PDB file of C-alpha atoms in Angstrom:
ATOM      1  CA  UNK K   3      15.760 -26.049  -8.458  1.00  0.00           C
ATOM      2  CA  UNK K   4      12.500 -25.444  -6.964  1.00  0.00           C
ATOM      3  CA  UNK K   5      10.828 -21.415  -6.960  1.00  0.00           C
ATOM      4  CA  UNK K   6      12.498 -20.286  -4.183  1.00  0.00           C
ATOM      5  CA  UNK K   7      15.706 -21.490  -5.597  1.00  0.00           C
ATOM      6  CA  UNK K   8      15.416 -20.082  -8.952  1.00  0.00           C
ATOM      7  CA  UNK K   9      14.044 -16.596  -7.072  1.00  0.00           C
ATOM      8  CA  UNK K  10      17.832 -16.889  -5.498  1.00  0.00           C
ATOM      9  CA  UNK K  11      19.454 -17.279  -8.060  1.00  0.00           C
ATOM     10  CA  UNK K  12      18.288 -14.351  -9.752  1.00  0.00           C
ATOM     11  CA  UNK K  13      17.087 -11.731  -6.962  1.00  0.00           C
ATOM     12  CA  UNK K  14      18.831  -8.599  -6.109  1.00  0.00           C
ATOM     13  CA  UNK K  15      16.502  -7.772  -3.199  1.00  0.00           C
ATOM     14  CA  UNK K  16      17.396  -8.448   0.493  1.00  0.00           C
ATOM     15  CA  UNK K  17      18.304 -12.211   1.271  1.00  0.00           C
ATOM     16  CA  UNK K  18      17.341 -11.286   4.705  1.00  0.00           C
ATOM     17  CA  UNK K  19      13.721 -10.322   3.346  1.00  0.00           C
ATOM     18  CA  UNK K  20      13.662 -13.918   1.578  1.00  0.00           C
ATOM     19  CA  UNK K  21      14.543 -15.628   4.593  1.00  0.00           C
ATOM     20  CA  UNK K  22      12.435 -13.587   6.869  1.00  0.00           C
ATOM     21  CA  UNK K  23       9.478 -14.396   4.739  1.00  0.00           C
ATOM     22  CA  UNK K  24      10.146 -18.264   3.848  1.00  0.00           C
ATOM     23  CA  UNK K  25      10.984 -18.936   7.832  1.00  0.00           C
ATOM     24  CA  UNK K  26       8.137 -16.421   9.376  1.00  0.00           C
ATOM     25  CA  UNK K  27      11.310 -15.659  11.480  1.00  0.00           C
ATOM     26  CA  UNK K  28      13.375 -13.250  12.228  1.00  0.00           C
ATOM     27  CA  UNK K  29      16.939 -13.262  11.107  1.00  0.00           C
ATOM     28  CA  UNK K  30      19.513 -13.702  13.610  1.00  0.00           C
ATOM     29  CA  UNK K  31      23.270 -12.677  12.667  1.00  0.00           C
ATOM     30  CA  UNK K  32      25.957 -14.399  14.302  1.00  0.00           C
ATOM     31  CA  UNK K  33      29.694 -13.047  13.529  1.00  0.00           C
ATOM     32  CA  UNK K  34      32.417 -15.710  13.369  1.00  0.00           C
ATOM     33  CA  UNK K  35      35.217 -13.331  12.419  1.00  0.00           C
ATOM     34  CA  UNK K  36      36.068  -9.848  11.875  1.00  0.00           C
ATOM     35  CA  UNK K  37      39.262  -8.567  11.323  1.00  0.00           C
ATOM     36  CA  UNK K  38      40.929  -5.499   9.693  1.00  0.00           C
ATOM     37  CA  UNK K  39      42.700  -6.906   6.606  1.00  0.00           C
ATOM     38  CA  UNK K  40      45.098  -4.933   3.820  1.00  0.00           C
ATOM     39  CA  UNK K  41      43.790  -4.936   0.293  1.00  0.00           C
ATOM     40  CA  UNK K  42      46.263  -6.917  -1.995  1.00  0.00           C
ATOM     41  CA  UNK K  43      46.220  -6.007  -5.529  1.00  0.00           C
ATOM     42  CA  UNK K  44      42.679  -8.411  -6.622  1.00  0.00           C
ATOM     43  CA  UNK K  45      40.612  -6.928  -3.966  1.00  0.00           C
ATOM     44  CA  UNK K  46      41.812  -3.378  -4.156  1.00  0.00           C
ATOM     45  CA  UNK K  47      40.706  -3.638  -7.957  1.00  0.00           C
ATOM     46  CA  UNK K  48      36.887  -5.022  -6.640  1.00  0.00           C
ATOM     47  CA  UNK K  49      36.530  -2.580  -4.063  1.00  0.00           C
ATOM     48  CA  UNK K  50      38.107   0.091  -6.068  1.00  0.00           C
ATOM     49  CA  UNK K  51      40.335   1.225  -3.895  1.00  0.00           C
ATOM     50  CA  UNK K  52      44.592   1.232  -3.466  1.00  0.00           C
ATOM     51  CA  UNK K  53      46.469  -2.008  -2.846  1.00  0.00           C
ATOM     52  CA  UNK K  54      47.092  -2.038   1.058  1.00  0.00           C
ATOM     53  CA  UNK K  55      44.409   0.278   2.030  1.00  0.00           C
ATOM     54  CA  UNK K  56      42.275  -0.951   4.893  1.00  0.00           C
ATOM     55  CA  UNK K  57      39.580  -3.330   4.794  1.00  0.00           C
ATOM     56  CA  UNK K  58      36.764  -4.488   7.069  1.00  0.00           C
ATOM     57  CA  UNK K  59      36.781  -8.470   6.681  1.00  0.00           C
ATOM     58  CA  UNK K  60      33.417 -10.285   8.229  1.00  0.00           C
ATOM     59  CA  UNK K  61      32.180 -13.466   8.196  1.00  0.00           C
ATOM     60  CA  UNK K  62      28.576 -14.327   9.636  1.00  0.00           C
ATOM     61  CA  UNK K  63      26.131 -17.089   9.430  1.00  0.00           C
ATOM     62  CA  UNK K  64      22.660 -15.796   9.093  1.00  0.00           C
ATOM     63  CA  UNK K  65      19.848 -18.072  10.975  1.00  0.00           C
ATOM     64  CA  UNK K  66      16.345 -17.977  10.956  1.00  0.00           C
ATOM     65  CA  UNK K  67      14.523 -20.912  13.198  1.00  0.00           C
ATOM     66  CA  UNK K  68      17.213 -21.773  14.857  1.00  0.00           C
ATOM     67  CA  UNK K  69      19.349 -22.835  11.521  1.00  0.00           C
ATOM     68  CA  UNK K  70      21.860 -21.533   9.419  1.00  0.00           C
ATOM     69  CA  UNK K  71      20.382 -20.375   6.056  1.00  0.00           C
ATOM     70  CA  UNK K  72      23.469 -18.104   4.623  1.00  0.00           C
ATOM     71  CA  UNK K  73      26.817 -17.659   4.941  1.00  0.00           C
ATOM     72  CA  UNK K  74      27.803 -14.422   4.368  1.00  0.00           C
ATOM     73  CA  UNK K  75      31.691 -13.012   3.892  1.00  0.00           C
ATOM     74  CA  UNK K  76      31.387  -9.408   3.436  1.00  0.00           C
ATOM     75  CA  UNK K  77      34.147  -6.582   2.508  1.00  0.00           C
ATOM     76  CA  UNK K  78      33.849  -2.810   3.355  1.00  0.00           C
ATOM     77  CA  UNK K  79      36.527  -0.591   2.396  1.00  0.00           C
ATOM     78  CA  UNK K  80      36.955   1.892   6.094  1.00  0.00           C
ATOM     79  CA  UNK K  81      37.943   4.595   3.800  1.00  0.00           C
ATOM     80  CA  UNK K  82      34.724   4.628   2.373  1.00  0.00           C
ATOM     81  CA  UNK K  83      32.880   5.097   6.050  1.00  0.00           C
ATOM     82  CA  UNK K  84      31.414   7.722   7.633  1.00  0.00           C
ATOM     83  CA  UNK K  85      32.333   8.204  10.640  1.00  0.00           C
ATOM     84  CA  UNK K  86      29.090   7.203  12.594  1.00  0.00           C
ATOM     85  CA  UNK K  87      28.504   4.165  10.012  1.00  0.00           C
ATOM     86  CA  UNK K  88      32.328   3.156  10.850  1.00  0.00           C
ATOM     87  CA  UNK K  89      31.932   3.444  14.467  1.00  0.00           C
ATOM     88  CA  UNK K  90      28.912   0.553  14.248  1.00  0.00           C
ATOM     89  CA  UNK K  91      30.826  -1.524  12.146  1.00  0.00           C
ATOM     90  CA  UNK K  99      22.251  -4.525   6.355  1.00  0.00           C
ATOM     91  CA  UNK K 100      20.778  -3.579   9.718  1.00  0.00           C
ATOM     92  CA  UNK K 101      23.313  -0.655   9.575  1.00  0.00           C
ATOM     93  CA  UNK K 102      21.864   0.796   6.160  1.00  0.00           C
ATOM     94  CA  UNK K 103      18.082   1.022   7.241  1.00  0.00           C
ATOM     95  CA  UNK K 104      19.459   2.533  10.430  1.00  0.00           C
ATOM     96  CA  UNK K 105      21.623   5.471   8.289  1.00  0.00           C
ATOM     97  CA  UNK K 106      19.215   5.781   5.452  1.00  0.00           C
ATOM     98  CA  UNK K 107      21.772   4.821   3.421  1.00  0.00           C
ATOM     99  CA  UNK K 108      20.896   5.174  -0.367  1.00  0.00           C
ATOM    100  CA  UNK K 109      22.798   2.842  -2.553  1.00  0.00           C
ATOM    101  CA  UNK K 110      22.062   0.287  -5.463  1.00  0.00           C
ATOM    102  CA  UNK K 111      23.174  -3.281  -5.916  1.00  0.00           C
ATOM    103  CA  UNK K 112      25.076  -5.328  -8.422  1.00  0.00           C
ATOM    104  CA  UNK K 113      24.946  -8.695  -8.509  1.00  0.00           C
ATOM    105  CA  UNK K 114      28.255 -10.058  -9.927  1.00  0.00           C
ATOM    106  CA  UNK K 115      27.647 -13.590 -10.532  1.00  0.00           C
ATOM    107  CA  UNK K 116      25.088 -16.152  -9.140  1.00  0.00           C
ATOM    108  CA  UNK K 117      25.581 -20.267  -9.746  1.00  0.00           C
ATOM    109  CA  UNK K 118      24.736 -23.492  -8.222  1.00  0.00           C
ATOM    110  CA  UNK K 119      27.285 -25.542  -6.794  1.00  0.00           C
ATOM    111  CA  UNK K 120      29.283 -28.253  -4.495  1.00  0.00           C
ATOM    112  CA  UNK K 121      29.655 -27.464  -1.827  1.00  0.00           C
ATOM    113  CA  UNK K 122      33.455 -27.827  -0.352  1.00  0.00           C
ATOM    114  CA  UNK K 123      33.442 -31.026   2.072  1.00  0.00           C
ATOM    115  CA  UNK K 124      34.535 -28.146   4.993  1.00  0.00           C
ATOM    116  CA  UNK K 125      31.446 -25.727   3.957  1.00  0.00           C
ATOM    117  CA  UNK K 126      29.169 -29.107   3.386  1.00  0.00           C
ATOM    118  CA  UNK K 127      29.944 -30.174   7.231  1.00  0.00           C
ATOM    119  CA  UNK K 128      30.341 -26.420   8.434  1.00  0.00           C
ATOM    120  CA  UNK K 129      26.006 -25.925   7.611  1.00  0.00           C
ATOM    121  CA  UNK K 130      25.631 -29.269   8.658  1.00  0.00           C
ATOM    122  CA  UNK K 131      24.189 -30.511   5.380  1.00  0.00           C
ATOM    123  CA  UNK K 132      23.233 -33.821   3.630  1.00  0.00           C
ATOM    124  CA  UNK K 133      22.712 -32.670   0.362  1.00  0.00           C
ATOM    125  CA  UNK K 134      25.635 -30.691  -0.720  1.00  0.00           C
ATOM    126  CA  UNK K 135      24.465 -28.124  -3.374  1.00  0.00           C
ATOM    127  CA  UNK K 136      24.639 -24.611  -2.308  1.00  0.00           C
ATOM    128  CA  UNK K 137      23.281 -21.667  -4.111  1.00  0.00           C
ATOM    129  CA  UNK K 138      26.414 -18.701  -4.266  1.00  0.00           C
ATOM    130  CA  UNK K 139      26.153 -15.568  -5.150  1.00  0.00           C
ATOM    131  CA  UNK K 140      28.469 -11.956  -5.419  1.00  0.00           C
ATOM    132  CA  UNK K 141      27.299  -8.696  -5.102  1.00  0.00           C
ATOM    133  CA  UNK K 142      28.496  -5.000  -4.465  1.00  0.00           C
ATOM    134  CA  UNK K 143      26.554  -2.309  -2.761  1.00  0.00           C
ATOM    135  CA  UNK K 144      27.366   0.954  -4.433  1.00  0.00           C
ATOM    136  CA  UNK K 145      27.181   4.263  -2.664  1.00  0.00           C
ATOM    137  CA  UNK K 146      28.224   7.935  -4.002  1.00  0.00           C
ATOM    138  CA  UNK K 147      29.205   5.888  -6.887  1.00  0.00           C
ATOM    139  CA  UNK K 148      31.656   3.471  -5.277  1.00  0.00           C
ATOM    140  CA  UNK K 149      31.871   0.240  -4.197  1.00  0.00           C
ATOM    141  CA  UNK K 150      30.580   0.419  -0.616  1.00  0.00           C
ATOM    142  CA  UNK K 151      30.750  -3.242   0.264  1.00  0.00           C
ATOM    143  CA  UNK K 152      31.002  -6.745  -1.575  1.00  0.00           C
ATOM    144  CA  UNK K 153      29.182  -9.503  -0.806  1.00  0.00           C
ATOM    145  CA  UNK K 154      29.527 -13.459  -1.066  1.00  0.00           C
ATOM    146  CA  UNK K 155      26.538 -15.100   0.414  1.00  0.00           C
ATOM    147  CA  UNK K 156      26.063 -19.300   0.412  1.00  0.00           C
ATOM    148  CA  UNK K 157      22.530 -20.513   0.727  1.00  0.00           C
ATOM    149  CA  UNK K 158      22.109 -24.096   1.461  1.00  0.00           C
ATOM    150  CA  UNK K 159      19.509 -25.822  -1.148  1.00  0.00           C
ATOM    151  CA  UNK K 160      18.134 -28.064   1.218  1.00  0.00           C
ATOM    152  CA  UNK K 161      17.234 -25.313   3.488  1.00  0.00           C
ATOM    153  CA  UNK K 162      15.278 -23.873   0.752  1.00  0.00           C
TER     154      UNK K 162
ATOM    155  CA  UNK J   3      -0.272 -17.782   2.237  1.00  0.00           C
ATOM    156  CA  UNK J   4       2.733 -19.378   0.528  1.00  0.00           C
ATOM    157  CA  UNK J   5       6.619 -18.805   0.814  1.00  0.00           C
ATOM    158  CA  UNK J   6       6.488 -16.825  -2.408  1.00  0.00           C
ATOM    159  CA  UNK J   7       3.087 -14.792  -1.480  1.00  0.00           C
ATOM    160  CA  UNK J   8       4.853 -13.743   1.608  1.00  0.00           C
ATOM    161  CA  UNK J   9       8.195 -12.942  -0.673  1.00  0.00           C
ATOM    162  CA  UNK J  10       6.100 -11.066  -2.626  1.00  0.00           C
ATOM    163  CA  UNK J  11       4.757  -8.717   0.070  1.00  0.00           C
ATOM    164  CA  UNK J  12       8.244  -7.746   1.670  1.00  0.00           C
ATOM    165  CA  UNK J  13      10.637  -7.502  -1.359  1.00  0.00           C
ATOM    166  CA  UNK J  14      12.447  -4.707  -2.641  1.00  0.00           C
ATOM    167  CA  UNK J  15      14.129  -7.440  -5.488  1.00  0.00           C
ATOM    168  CA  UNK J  16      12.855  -7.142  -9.268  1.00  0.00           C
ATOM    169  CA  UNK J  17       9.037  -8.536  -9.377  1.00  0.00           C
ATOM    170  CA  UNK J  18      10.113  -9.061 -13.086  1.00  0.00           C
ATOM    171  CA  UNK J  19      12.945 -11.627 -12.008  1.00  0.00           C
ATOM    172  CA  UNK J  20      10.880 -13.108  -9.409  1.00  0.00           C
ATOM    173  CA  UNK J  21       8.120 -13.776 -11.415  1.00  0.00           C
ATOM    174  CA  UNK J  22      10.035 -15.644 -14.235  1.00  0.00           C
ATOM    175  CA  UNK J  23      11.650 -17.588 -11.395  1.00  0.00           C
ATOM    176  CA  UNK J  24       8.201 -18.451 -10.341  1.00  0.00           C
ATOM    177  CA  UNK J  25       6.919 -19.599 -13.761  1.00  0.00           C
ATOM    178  CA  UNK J  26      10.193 -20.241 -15.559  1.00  0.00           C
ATOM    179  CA  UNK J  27       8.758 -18.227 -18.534  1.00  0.00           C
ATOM    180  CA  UNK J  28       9.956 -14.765 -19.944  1.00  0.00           C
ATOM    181  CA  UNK J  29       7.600 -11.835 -19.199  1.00  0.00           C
ATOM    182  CA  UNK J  30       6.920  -8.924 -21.387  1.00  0.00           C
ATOM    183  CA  UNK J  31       6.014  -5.679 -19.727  1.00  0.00           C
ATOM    184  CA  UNK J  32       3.024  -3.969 -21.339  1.00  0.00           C
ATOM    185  CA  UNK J  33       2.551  -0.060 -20.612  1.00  0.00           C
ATOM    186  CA  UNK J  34      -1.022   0.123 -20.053  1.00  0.00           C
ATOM    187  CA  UNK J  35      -1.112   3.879 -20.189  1.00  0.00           C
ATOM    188  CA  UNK J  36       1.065   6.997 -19.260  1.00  0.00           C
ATOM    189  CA  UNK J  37      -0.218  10.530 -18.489  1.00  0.00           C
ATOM    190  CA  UNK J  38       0.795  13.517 -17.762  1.00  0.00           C
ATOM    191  CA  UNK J  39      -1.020  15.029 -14.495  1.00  0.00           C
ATOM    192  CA  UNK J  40      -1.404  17.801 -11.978  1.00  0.00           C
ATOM    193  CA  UNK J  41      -0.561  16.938  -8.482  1.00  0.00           C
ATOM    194  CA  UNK J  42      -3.799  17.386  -6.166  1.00  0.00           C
ATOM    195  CA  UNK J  43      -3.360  18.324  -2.684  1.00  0.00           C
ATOM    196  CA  UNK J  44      -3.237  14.081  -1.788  1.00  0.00           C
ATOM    197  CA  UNK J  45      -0.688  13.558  -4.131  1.00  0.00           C
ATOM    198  CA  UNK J  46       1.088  16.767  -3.367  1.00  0.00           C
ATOM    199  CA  UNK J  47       1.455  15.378   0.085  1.00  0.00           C
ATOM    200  CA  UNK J  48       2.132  11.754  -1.059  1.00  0.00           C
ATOM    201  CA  UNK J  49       5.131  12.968  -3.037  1.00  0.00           C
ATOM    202  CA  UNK J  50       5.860  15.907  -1.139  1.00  0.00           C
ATOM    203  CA  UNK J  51       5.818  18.581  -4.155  1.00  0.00           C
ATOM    204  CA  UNK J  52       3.552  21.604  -5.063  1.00  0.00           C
ATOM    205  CA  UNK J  53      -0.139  21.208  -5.415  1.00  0.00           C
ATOM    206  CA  UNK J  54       0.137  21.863  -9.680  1.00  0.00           C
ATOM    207  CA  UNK J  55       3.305  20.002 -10.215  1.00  0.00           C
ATOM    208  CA  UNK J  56       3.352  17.583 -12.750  1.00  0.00           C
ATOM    209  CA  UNK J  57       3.430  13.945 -12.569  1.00  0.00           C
ATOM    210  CA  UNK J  58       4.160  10.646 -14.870  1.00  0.00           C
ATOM    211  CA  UNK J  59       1.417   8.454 -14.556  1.00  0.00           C
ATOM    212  CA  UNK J  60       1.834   5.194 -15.409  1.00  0.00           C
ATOM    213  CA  UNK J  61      -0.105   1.788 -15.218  1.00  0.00           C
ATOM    214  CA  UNK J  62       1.458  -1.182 -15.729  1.00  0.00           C
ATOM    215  CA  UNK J  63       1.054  -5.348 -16.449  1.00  0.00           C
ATOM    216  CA  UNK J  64       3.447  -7.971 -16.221  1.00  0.00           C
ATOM    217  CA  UNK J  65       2.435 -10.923 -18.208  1.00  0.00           C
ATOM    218  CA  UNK J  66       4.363 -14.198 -18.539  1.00  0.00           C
ATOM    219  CA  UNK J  67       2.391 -16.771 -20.900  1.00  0.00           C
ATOM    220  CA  UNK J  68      -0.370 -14.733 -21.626  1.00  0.00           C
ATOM    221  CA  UNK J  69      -1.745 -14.088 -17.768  1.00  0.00           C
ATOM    222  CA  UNK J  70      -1.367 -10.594 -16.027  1.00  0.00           C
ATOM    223  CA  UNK J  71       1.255 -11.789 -12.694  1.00  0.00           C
ATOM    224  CA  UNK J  72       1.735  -8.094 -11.616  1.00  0.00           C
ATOM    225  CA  UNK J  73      -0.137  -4.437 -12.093  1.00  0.00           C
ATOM    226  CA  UNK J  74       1.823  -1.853 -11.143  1.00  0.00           C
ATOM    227  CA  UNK J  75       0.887   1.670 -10.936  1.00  0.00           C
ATOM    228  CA  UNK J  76       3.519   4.622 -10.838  1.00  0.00           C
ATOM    229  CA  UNK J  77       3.570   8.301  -9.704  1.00  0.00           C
ATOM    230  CA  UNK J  78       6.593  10.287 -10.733  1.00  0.00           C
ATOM    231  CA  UNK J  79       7.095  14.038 -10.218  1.00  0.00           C
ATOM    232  CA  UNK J  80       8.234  15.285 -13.438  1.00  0.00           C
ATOM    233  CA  UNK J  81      10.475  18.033 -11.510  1.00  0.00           C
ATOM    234  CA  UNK J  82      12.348  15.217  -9.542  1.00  0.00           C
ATOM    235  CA  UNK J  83      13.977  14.130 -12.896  1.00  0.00           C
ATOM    236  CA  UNK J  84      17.361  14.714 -14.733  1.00  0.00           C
ATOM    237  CA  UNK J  85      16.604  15.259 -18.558  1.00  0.00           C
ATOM    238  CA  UNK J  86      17.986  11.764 -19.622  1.00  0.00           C
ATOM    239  CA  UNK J  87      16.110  10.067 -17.239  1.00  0.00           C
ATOM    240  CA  UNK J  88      13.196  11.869 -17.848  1.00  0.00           C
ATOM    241  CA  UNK J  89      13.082  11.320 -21.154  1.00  0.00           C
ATOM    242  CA  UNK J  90      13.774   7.832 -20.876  1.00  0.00           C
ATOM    243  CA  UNK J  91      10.871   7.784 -18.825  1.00  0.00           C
ATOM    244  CA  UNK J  92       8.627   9.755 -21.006  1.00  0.00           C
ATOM    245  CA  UNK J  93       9.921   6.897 -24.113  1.00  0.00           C
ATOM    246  CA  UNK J  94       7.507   4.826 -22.079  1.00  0.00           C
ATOM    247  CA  UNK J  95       8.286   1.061 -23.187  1.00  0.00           C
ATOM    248  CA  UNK J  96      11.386   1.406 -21.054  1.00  0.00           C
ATOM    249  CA  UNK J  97      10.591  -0.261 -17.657  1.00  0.00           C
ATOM    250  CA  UNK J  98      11.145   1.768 -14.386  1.00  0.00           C
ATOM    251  CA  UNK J  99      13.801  -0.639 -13.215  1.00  0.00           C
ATOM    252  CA  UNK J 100      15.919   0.000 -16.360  1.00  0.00           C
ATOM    253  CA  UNK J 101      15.625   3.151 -16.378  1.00  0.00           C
ATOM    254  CA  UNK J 102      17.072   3.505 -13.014  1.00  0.00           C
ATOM    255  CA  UNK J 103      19.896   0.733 -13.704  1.00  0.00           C
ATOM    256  CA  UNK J 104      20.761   2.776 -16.726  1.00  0.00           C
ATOM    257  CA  UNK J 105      21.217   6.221 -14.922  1.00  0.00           C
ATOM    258  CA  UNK J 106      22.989   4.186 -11.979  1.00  0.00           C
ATOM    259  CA  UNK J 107      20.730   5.199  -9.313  1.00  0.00           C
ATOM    260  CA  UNK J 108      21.252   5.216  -5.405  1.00  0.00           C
ATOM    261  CA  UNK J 109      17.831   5.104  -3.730  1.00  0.00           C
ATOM    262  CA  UNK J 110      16.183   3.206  -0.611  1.00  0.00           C
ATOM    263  CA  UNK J 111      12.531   2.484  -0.293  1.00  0.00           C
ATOM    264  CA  UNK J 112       9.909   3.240   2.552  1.00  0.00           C
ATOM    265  CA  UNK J 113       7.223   0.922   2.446  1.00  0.00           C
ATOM    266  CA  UNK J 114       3.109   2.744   2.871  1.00  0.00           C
ATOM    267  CA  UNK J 115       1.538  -0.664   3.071  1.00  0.00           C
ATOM    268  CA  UNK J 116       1.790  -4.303   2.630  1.00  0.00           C
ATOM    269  CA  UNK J 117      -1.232  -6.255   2.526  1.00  0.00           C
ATOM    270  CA  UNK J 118      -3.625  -9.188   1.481  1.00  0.00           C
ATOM    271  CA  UNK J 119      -7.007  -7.675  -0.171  1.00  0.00           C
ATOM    272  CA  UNK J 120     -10.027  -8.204  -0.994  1.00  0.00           C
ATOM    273  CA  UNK J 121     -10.080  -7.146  -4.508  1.00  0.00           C
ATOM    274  CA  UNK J 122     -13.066  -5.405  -5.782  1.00  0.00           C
ATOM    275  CA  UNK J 123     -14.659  -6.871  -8.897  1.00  0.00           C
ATOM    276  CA  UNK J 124     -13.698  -4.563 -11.477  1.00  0.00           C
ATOM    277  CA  UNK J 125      -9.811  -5.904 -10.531  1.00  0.00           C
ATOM    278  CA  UNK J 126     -10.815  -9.014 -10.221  1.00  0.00           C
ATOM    279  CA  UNK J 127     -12.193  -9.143 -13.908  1.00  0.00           C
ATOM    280  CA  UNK J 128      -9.156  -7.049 -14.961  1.00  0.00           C
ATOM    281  CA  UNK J 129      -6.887  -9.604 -13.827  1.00  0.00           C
ATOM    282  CA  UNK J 130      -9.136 -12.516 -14.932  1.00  0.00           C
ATOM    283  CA  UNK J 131      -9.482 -14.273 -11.036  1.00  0.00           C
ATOM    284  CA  UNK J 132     -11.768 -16.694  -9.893  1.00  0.00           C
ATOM    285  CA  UNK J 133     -10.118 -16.504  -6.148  1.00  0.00           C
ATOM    286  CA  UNK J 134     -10.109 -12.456  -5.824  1.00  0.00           C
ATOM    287  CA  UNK J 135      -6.987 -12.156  -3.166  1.00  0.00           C
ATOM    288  CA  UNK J 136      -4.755 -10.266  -4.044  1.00  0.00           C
ATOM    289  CA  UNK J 137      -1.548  -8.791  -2.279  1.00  0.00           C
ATOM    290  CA  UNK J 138      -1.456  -4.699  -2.441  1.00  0.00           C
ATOM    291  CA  UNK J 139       1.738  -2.985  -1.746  1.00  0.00           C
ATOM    292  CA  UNK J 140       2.652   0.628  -1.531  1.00  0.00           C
ATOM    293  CA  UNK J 141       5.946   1.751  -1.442  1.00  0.00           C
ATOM    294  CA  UNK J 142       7.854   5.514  -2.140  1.00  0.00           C
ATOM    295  CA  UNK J 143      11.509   5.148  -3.853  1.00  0.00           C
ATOM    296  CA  UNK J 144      13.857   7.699  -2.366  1.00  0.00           C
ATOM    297  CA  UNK J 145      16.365   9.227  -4.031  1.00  0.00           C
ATOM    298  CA  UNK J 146      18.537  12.173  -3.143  1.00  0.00           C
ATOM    299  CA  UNK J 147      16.501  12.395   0.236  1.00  0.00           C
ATOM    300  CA  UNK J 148      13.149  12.940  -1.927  1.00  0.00           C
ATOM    301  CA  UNK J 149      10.521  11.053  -3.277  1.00  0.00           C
ATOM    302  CA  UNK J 150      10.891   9.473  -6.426  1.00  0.00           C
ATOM    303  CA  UNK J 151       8.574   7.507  -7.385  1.00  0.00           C
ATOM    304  CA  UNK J 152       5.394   6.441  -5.238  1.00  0.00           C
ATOM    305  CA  UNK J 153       4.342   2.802  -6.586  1.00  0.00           C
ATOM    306  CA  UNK J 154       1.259   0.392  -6.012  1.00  0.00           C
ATOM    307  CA  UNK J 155       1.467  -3.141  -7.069  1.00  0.00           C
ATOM    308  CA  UNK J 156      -1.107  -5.961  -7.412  1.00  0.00           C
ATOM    309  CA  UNK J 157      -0.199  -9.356  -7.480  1.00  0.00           C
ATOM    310  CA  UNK J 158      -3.361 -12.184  -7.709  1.00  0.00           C
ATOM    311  CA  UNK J 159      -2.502 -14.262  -5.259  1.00  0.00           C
ATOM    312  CA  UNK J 160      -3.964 -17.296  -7.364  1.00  0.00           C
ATOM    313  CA  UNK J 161      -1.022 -17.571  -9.668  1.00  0.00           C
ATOM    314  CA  UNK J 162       1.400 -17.710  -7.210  1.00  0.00           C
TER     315      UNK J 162
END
């Protein structure tokens, strides 16, 4: 683990920001699914909501250079929306002013699935994961797993 | 300019966390000093209260081994406050950062400035720096639609 390794696996400031700064680049999203799922019972209890209420499921590599440097799987509760912030679903926050703090549920090192390994296009396999929710008005607004390749870093 | 210099400068992440991630060592947060003030008409404007108000002054280091990483310097309208977090606040050897975990609050930041300096030599001798850059940072916490807390910070670039 070099610096900017251990500064992952311990930051709760914008990965964006990190990546931003470390490339010189800017971060470009790309979305590789998005779907409306129903909360089952486990993820109604993380977002705090009711089993089979709506959720917004995304998936998005993050790039910076022209190379991946997170994946990100996100869920957002639509209950929880308003209904401008809805209609346009990070870059969304700064845009509202959304006020909100974050809580970073676990952080560890790790292989690496074969699929995920290939998927960034990797040699070494060791990815840095991490969980977070972004809390607004008290509730889970959105969780967060992110999956930063090492070697990138 | 290194990857974690130019981390440093755009960050709203713990400095605290990222500098024992940079030197793998614990640091302890000394408060420097902490006053109680009367806005001037600058700081009026810069927090957007009356000319008069009070303010929590604070100055801050963050050491890790025995060398200053971080000053940190911290304007905070007394009037802004809830009475638990203001008291927490006025306890003084509770960081800012904990202090706002503890009370669970929602804020966003606007950043005044980012920038590499050119540190005079009364800094410079503060911070004990034979290479005087330093990166100086402004930035207002917003809470509830108001300002917060206004904060500078100084990080010597040299033991980054």
């Amino acid at each position: 683990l070099n610096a900017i390794h251990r500064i992952l696996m311990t930051t709760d400031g914008s990965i964006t920001a990190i990546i931003e700064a470390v490339t010189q680049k800017k971060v470009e999203v790309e979305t590789l699914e998005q779907k409306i799922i129903r909360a089952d019972r486990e993820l109604a209890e993380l977002l705090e909501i009711d089993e089979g209420d709506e959720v917004n499921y995304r998936v998005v590599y993050l790039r910076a250079n022209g190379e991946i440097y997170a994946k990100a799987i996100s869920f957002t509760p639509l209950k929880r929306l308003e209904n401008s912030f809805r209609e346009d679903l990070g870059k969304i926050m700064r845009k509202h002013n959304i006020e909100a703090r974050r809580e970073i549920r676990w952080s560890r090192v790790e292989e690496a699935d074969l699929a995920l390994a290939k998927e960034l296009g990797i040699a070494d396999r060791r990815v840095i994961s991490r969980n977070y929710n972004i809390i607004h008005r008290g509730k889970v607004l959105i969780n967060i797993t992110e999956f930063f390749p090492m070697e990138r870093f």
